[PDB]
């Protein structure tokens, strides 16, 4: 010991590495390229046991000889025979050995009681300044403004208190539940252990009656089709095979995962299925996903990076005022303690102690016009990132196309003729064609709705007959995926013998049909449909007087048509995006030529534009550049994207700058596609809910999830409108809320500084401003203007220009400085003009600062000053490009006008008991004063307009560079 720095911690975290290395001397150290702070160990259970957690992975390594990190399964070069060598459960001695290295199978959360949370939220370097300012004002003033800043801060800490507890309470009501699930023991026992005490080395014998899931296991013996609703999005039973003998990511369909509610539980070898454990709840699939959203990505926005840097220029403009102020305030011979309280007030007048609150009010107003609109947002500062989007990547299942299938009709065939597609199957008369597809099903007529496969529900309502003239006699062959067809034996009254109504895949069934029935125009009609983005099955029949006698030399009646139609409001939106110079992309877990006819329809790839298929081949060979005919775009595939991301990484930025359609994308292959496009220095946006959205959604910058009301397993935008009509009104709520976070920050810097200038042009002559006056100014004119200002509203037409986002650049600084030369000027011009006036008498200087108050210089400086705050506020809020014109903000205009009228009245008339003004001004030059304030109004608006036209005639973001580059030399050679 004797290395504790507690004696130096009682006399006071900018650099965490330069402080922990002095407070503490391979033991309890963790520093490798990322934030260097998780320093603990356990070393229990009479072993080495390198325990330390970082976000849920123990990294079990103290050295390289007898230690190696990445505890997730620890044996990545494993054999598929090894899980077949270990079908039996692990021995009870060894069961409490693997539990000591691995986790306790609970991805838990801390409790985080109130002292704790509070402390964290408060000890931050701004709320210290709101505990130095309140304790400085209370020595004089206060009472009113201090109570108000303290209350506003308390509600600013009690809202983050209850919002952060509810994030923990919602995740606690999630997984880490308890469930008894029997195992196989060391030798043939069950014991019904809990689902949170099994480790890799054991097995699972799952009960077929009920159970949610314990864990992810390798199916050593069995076969099932589990409910995949919470795992891969597809709520249908997904066929999951057993593991063959001889890399569990390659054996995806061979291993069953966590969250799998079992449906079949088919043993087919013996009494019960056997599945041996692979991982544990700490680092498994969906065990890592819940822990991933507990440590989110930081919103690396350059707007906030120049907002915490511009205050640190106001934190040095104070120190060039509180040296001068001491000198002047002493020269006039104050008795001392006031010199100190005064220089300190100057510090609180020029660093605005409620600037944070105004920024929060602007964003709160945001949410309140999205939650009324329909879009639900949970993270407020993500809304500002929505306007600076230059890439929007879409899904297609339930995002652009309709989620479920439908039908255009049947294309029958009577003697090799191809009578055309019927738009509605009730129109053509009754026969074997419409008795078949209305009855060729194995649906469950149960509780008023047939429940089964998605696509075969829609064929029933297409012609819409009654259901129970025929009746379901017997299903001789249930639909398996190996034969790609299903036969239904059915009879009806009025017939002599039943017929074998059968549907199935076109080429595999019609070859089994009669060749005198199927024509030679069967192949050409097939790729006339499936190349236009259609799903197609064929239908046949044969009379019957079981086995496959019902399926042989059939009579192929015709083809059936299925397709995923677009939503009615996804065509005029994709035109609305790429007319505003931001370009859309689809990512797709379906077939390629399905997702090309969508992009030609909705408007990703417009007509009279080129597109090129990329197919590059396992082997590192060439690209082959396949075209299509029907700017520049190019479509590519899933495994093609895996080749050129590794074999050609120097050729990759000339493909993702033009890549529009990404098909066959794996659910993990999407989250680097949304990440390679972030180190090309775009600002991406995901928008889609469906099967495979989960991995790339949080890794994006603005992720919208459709067709769900309120959920927290999401990137922080979750619309409840089920269309991509929301993605304009999220990038239109990041432009009227990022060009508002200028107009509140700028008014604030300008107010602080007009107050600094007045308090200074008025510490000279020893005539400090008075208390009700400062209160009036701050509370009234700055709680009203800021609050009311932040609610103007969004526009109706999206523009080709983006907000700047950088508020240290010349335009902001220049407006502040010019508007300020005009403000100093009006306040000083006023002081000099009040002086040279013939009735004027000077202030009794050799008295004191706040008993020198029924006089004149303070009356003139305070009047010119209040009008200025209101004029600067109206000037710094303009709405021609982005938000809305100002006259639609009725509350504000009414306030500006009423405050302005109370102030004009103070000037031209009586508030002279309060506000400590000069008793009356006799002569009629109160009018020149009013004129100086009019010159200032015209002044501010004109200056701001002239500066708004600032064409400083005197392409670094990578995408821009590439585009120029490609434009010179295209790249699809």
Author numbering: 60 to 71, 113 to 125, 140 to 360, 365 to 582, 610 to 613, 620 to 696, 708 to 779, 784 to 796, ...
The authors write:
ATP13A2 belongs to the orphan P5B adenosine triphosphatases (ATPase) family and has been established as a lysosomal polyamine exporter to maintain the normal function of lysosomes and mitochondria. The structure of the human ATP13A2 adopts the typical P-type ATPase fold with overall dimensions of 125 Å × 75 Å × 70 Å, including ten transmembrane (TM) helices and three conserved cytoplasmic domains [N (nucleotide-binding) domain; A (actuator) domain; and P (phosphorylation) domain]. In addition, the P5B type ATP13A2 also comprises two specific domains: a C-terminal extension domain (CTD) laying close to the P-domain and an N-terminal domain (NTD) preceding the A domain showing amphipathic feature.
Comparison between this state and the E1P-ADP state reveals a door sliding motion formed by TM1 and TM2 accompanied by the rotation of the A domain and the tilt of the N domain. The conformational change in TMD creates a spindly negatively charged cavity that allows substrate entry from the lysosomal matrix. For instance, the amine nitrogen atoms are coordinated by D254, D463, D960, and D967 via hydrogen bonding interactions and by W251 and F963 via cation–π interactions. In addition, human ATP13A2 contains a narrow tunnel ― formed by TMs 1, 2, 4, 5, 6 ― than that of Spf1, due to the spindly character of the spermine substrate. The E2P to E2-Pi transition is accompanied by the rearrangement of the A domain and the binding of SPM molecule in lysosomal lumen to the substrate cavity in the TMD of ATP13A2, thereby facilitating the dephosphorylation reaction. Interestingly, the E2P-inhibit state of Ypk9 reveals a long N terminal loop that interacts with the A- and N-domains and hijacks the ATPase in the E2P state.
